[model samples]
Target: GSMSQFTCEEDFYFPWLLIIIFGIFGLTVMLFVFLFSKQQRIK
Candidate 1:
């Protein structure tokens, strides 16, 4: 009974949650890289 409760949320959340969080993190890194390179070009 208790074990089922732990497994339930993990089964539901882990897949999409990690993908979305990681996707956002990648986009953020790309944005920063673009901005940094643009600034370097301007200077």
Candidate 2:
């Protein structure tokens, strides 16, 4: 009963979902680095 199309579909969608998550994380890290360097210059 547990077997369904949803679980099967997840196998395909999971990689794209993972990519989006990592993309957001990478952008956040870049933003933090840029802000930190700018702050150092102001000090």
Candidate 3:
């Protein structure tokens, strides 16, 4: 038996993966910038 194409279509229902990727990227940049600024202030 073969898998139905309908299930494949469901994968594109929402941009959930893109949302998660961007969220993590934003979080990492914010954290890095915070720490970097702190280090610079101490110097």
Candidate 4:
């Protein structure tokens, strides 16, 4: 018997995973930007 295959192939998984990873990375960058922006100005 042939093995059952996923309707959306496993190859499709990597691109979406990469997109999510990049999205998280962008979120992290935003956090860092906000953190740095709040620092007190030196005289």
Candidate 5:
């Protein structure tokens, strides 16, 4: 226990990037579905 610089670095292992990507995908899919529905109604 001497001259030790410790950093708790486990936080980066979580799925932040995965969640971000999937979240964006989810939103895009929802947006596309909404637009498709609107197109169907308008056509």
Candidate 6:
């Protein structure tokens, strides 16, 4: 139910949805690396 096909049949908004997914993923990785660097510097 989470990853349903609600937008599968609607191709108009698929690009925006796809970009948002990757954007969030990239932001998560960037945040993780930022925290890691801070922790290492503190140590």
* Candidate with the greatest lDDT versus the true structure: 5
Q: What is the lDDT of residue 12 in candidate 6?
A: 73
Worst 10 residues of 3 by lDDT: 1-10
Q: lDDT tens digits, residues 1-43, model 5? A: 8797878687588778998999999999999889989889755
Best by TM-score: 5
Clashes of 2: 0
Per-residue lDDT of 36 in model 5:
89
Q: What are the per-residue Cα lDDT tens digits for candidate 2 across 1-43?
A: 8866544646675568889899999999999889989889755
Clashes of 3: 0
* Superposition error at 10 for model 4 (Å): 8.9
Per-residue lDDT, model 6, residue 27, is 100
TM-score of each: 0.53, 0.52, 0.55, 0.49, 0.55, 0.51
Worst 10 residues of 4 by lDDT: 5-14
lDDT of 3 by residue, 1-43 (tens): 5875544756678888999999999999999889989889655
Compared with the true structure, all predictions reach lDDT values of 0.81, 0.82, 0.85, 0.78, 0.87, 0.82
- Estimate, for each residue in 1-43, the C-alpha lDDT of model 6 and write its tens digit: 6775544556575578888899999999999889989888754
Cα deviation at 14, candidate 5, in Å, is: 1.9
Tens-place lDDT digits, model 1, residues 1-43: 5554334556575578889999999999999889989889755
Off by over 4 Å in 5: 1-11, 41-43
User: Residue 20, candidate 1: how far off, in angstroms?
Assistant: 0.6
Q: Which regions of candidate 3 deviate over 4 angstroms?
A: 1-12, 41-43
